[PDB]
Structure 1
Amino acid sequence: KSDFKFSNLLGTVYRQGNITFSDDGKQLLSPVGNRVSVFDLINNKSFTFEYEHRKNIAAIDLNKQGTLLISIDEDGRAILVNFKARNVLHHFNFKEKCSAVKFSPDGRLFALASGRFLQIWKTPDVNKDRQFAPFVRHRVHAGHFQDITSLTWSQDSRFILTTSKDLSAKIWSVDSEEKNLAATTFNGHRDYVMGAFFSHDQEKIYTVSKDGAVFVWEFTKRKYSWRITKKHFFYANQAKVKCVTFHPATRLLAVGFTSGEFRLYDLPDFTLIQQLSMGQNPVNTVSVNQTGEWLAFGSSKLGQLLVYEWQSESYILKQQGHFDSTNSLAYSPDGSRVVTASEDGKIKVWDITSGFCLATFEEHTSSVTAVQFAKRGQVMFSSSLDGTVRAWDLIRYRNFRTFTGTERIQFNCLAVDPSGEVVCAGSLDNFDIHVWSVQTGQLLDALSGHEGPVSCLSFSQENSVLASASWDKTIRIWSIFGRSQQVEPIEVYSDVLALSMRPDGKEVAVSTLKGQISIFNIEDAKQVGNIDCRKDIISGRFNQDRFTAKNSERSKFFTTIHYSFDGMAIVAGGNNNSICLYDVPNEVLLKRFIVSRNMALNGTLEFLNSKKMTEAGSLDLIDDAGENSDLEDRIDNSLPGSQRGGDLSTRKMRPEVRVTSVQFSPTANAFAAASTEGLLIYSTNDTILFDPFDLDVTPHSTVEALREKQFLNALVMAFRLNEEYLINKVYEAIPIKEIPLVASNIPAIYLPRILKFIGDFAIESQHIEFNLIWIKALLSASGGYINEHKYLFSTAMRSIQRFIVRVAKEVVNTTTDNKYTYRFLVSTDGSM
Structure 2
Amino acid sequence: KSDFKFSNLLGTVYRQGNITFSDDGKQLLSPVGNRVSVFDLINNKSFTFEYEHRKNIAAIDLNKQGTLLISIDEDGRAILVNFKARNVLHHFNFKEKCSAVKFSPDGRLFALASGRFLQIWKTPDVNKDRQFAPFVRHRVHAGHFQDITSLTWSQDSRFILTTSKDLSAKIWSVDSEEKNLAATTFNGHRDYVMGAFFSHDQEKIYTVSKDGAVFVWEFTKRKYSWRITKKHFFYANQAKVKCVTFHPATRLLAVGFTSGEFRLYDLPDFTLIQQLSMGQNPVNTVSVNQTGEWLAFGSSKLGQLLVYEWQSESYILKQQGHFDSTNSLAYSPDGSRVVTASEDGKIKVWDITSGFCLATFEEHTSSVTAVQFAKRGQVMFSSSLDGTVRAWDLIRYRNFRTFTGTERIQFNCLAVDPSGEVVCAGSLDNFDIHVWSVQTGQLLDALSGHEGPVSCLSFSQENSVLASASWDKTIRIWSIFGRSQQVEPIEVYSDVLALSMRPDGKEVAVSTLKGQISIFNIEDAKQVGNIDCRKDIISGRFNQDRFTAKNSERSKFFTTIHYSFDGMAIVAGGNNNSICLYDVPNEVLLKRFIVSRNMALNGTLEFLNSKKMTEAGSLDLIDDAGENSDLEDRIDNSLPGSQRGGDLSTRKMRPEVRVTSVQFSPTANAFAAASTEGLLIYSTNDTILFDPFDLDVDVTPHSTVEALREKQFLNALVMAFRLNEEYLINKVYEAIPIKEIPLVASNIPAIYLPRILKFIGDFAIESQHIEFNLIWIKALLSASGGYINEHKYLFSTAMRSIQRFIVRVAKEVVNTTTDNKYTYRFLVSTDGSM
Instruction: Report the TM-score, using the length of structure 2 for normalisation.
Output: 0.83
Describe the superposition over 1:435-464 as per-residue Cα deviations: whole angstroms up to 9, x where unpaired: 122211112221111222110011112212
Tell me if the contact between 1:84 and 1:690 (Cα under 8 Å) persists in the aligned partners.
Answer: no
The percent identity for this pair of structures is: 100
CA distance in 2: counterparts of 1:772 and 1:352, whole angstroms: 24
Using the TM superposition, name which of 467-476 and 397-406 deviates more: 397-406
Tell me if the contact between 1:329 and 1:661 (Cα under 8 Å) persists in the aligned partners.
Answer: yes
Of 702, 706, 714, 2:704 maps to 702
Could you list the structure 1 runs, at least 4 aligned residues long, displaced by more than 6 angstroms after superposition.
688-832
Using the TM superposition, name which of 274-283 and 77-86 deviates more: 274-283
Q: What is the CA-CA distance between 1:584 and the residue it aligns to? A: 0.3
Q: Which of 1 and 2 has greater Rg?
A: 1
TM-aligned CA distance change 1:770 to 1:579, over 3 Å: closer
TM-aligned CA distance change 1:229 to 1:701, over 3 Å: farther
CA distance in 1: counterparts of 2:832 and 2:441, whole angstroms: 85
Describe the superposition over 1:197-243 as per-residue Cα deviations: whole angstroms up to 9, x where unpaired: 11111111001111111111111112421111111111222321111
Q: What is the CA-CA distance between 1:19 and the residue it aligns to? A: 1.3
Using the TM superposition, name which of 349-358 and 731-740 deviates more: 731-740
Q: What is the CA-CA distance between 1:582 and the residue it aligns to? A: 1.3
CA distance in 1: counterparts of 2:530 and 2:770, whole angstroms: 58
Tell me if the contact between 1:84 and 1:691 (Cα under 8 Å) persists in the aligned partners.
Answer: no
Tell me if the contact between 1:520 and 1:527 (Cα under 8 Å) persists in the aligned partners.
Answer: yes
Tell me if the contact between 1:257 and 1:282 (Cα under 8 Å) persists in the aligned partners.
Answer: yes
Q: What is the CA-CA distance between 1:64 and the residue it aligns to? A: 1.0
Describe the superposition over 1:512-537 as per-residue Cα deviations: whole angstroms up to 9, x where unpaired: 21111111221222222221121110
Describe the superposition over 1:334-357 as per-residue Cα deviations: whole angstroms up to 9, x where unpaired: 121211111122212222212221
TM-aligned CA distance change 1:794 to 1:449, over 3 Å: closer
Using the TM superposition, name which of 723-732 and 563-572 deviates more: 723-732
Which SS does the other structure have where 1:804 is aligned? helix
- Structure 1: gaps (5+ residues): none
TM-aligned CA distance change 1:723 to 1:650, over 3 Å: closer
Tell me if the contact between 1:306 and 1:317 (Cα under 8 Å) persists in the aligned partners.
Answer: yes
Q: What is the CA-CA distance between 1:47 and the residue it aligns to? A: 2.0
Q: What is the CA-CA distance between 1:383 and the residue it aligns to? A: 1.6
Using the TM superposition, name which of 718-727 and 324-333 deviates more: 718-727
TM-aligned CA distance change 1:498 to 1:721, over 3 Å: closer
Tell me if the contact between 1:691 and 1:747 (Cα under 8 Å) persists in the aligned partners.
Answer: no
Describe the superposition over 1:582-622 as per-residue Cα deviations: whole angstroms up to 9, x where unpaired: 11010111111111110010000111111111111111111
**1:726 paired residue number:** 728
CA distance in 1: counterparts of 2:473 and 2:767, whole angstroms: 73
Confirm or deny that 1:133 pairs with 2:126.
no
Q: What is the CA-CA distance between 1:136 and the residue it aligns to? A: 1.0
CA distance in 2: counterparts of 1:651 and 1:220, whole angstroms: 55
CA distance in 1: counterparts of 2:651 and 2:812, whole angstroms: 74
TM-aligned CA distance change 1:758 to 1:690, over 3 Å: closer
Tell me if the contact between 1:346 and 1:364 (Cα under 8 Å) persists in the aligned partners.
Answer: yes
Which SS does the other structure have where 1:799 is aligned? coil
- Structure 2: gaps (5+ residues): none
Tell me if the contact between 1:85 and 1:690 (Cα under 8 Å) persists in the aligned partners.
Answer: no
CA distance in 1: counterparts of 2:827 and 2:484, whole angstroms: 74
Using the TM superposition, name which of 403-412 and 137-146 deviates more: 403-412
Describe the superposition over 1:718-751 as per-residue Cα deviations: whole angstroms up to 9, x where unpaired: 9999999999999999999999999999999999
Q: What is the CA-CA distance between 1:386 and the residue it aligns to? A: 2.6
TM-aligned CA distance change 1:787 to 1:352, over 3 Å: farther
**1:323 paired residue number:** 323
TM-aligned CA distance change 1:804 to 1:683, over 3 Å: closer
Q: What is the CA-CA distance between 1:702 and the residue it aligns to? A: 25
Tell me if the contact between 2:667 and 2:800 (Cα under 8 Å) persists in the aligned partners.
Answer: no
Which SS does the other structure have where 1:625 is aligned? coil
CA distance in 2: counterparts of 1:236 and 1:806, whole angstroms: 49
Superposition map of 1:99-498 within 5 A: 99-498=99-498
Q: What is the CA-CA distance between 1:372 and the residue it aligns to? A: 1.9
Tell me if the contact between 1:670 and 1:683 (Cα under 8 Å) persists in the aligned partners.
Answer: yes
Which SS does the other structure have where 1:274 is aligned? strand
Tell me if the contact between 1:86 and 1:690 (Cα under 8 Å) persists in the aligned partners.
Answer: no
Describe the superposition over 1:394-444 as per-residue Cα deviations: whole angstroms up to 9, x where unpaired: 332322311222234321111122111122111122231111222111122
Q: What is the CA-CA distance between 1:560 and the residue it aligns to? A: 0.3
Tell me if the contact between 1:340 and 1:349 (Cα under 8 Å) persists in the aligned partners.
Answer: yes
CA distance in 1: counterparts of 2:343 and 2:817, whole angstroms: 69
CA distance in 2: counterparts of 1:445 and 1:703, whole angstroms: 65
Tell me if the contact between 2:577 and 2:595 (Cα under 8 Å) persists in the aligned partners.
Answer: yes
Describe the superposition over 1:608-667 as per-residue Cα deviations: whole angstroms up to 9, x where unpaired: 111111111111111111101111111111112211111112211110001101100122
Q: What is the CA-CA distance between 1:830 and the residue it aligns to? A: 78
TM-aligned CA distance change 1:773 to 1:52, over 3 Å: same
Tell me if the contact between 1:85 and 1:691 (Cα under 8 Å) persists in the aligned partners.
Answer: no
Which SS does the other structure have where 1:297 is aligned? strand
Confirm or deny that 1:538 pairs with 2:538.
yes
Tell me if the contact between 1:84 and 1:692 (Cα under 8 Å) persists in the aligned partners.
Answer: no
CA distance in 1: counterparts of 2:743 and 2:77, whole angstroms: 40
TM-aligned CA distance change 1:757 to 1:536, over 3 Å: closer
Q: What is the CA-CA distance between 1:799 and the residue it aligns to? A: 24
**1:574 paired residue number:** 574
Using the TM superposition, name which of 20-29 and 198-207 deviates more: 20-29
Using the TM superposition, name which of 371-380 and 204-213 deviates more: 371-380
TM-aligned CA distance change 1:466 to 1:274, over 3 Å: same
Describe the superposition over 1:53-96 as per-residue Cα deviations: whole angstroms up to 9, x where unpaired: 11001111111121111111101111111112221111111111
CA distance in 2: counterparts of 1:14 and 1:813, whole angstroms: 37
Q: What is the CA-CA distance between 1:389 and the residue it aligns to? A: 1.7
TM-aligned CA distance change 1:123 to 1:739, over 3 Å: farther
Q: What is the CA-CA distance between 1:466 and the residue it aligns to? A: 1.2
TM-aligned CA distance change 1:730 to 1:512, over 3 Å: closer
Instruction: Report the TM-score, using the length of structure 1 for normalisation.
Output: 0.83
Q: CA RMSD in A?
A: 12.2
Using the TM superposition, name which of 520-529 and 264-273 deviates more: 520-529
Describe the superposition over 1:235-255 as per-residue Cα deviations: whole angstroms up to 9, x where unpaired: 222321111111111111111
Q: What is the CA-CA distance between 1:283 and the residue it aligns to? A: 0.8
Q: What is the CA-CA distance between 1:363 and the residue it aligns to? A: 1.9
CA distance in 2: counterparts of 1:607 and 1:377, whole angstroms: 45
Tell me if the contact between 2:693 and 2:721 (Cα under 8 Å) persists in the aligned partners.
Answer: no
Tell me if the contact between 2:690 and 2:725 (Cα under 8 Å) persists in the aligned partners.
Answer: no
Using the TM superposition, name which of 440-449 and 309-318 deviates more: 309-318
**1:791 paired residue number:** 793
Which SS does the other structure have where 2:444 is aligned? strand
Tell me if the contact between 1:60 and 1:72 (Cα under 8 Å) persists in the aligned partners.
Answer: yes
CA distance in 2: counterparts of 1:259 and 1:824, whole angstroms: 55
Using the TM superposition, name which of 531-540 and 694-703 deviates more: 694-703
TM-aligned CA distance change 1:27 to 1:766, over 3 Å: closer
Which SS does the other structure have where 1:185 is aligned? coil
**1:761 paired residue number:** 763
CA distance in 1: counterparts of 2:710 and 2:177, whole angstroms: 44
Tell me if the contact between 1:539 and 1:549 (Cα under 8 Å) persists in the aligned partners.
Answer: yes
Tell me if the contact between 2:338 and 2:350 (Cα under 8 Å) persists in the aligned partners.
Answer: yes
Q: What is the CA-CA distance between 1:147 and the residue it aligns to? A: 0.7
Q: What is the CA-CA distance between 1:670 and the residue it aligns to? A: 0.7
TM-aligned CA distance change 1:246 to 1:85, over 3 Å: same
**1:816 paired residue number:** 818
Describe the superposition over 1:557-595 as per-residue Cα deviations: whole angstroms up to 9, x where unpaired: 111010111211100100000101011010111111111
TM-aligned CA distance change 1:774 to 1:96, over 3 Å: farther
Using the TM superposition, name which of 732-741 and 680-689 deviates more: 732-741
CA distance in 2: counterparts of 1:807 and 1:312, whole angstroms: 30
CA distance in 1: counterparts of 2:546 and 2:627, whole angstroms: 27
CA distance in 1: counterparts of 2:743 and 2:164, whole angstroms: 56
CA distance in 2: counterparts of 1:253 and 1:391, whole angstroms: 46
Tell me if the contact between 1:45 and 1:356 (Cα under 8 Å) persists in the aligned partners.
Answer: no
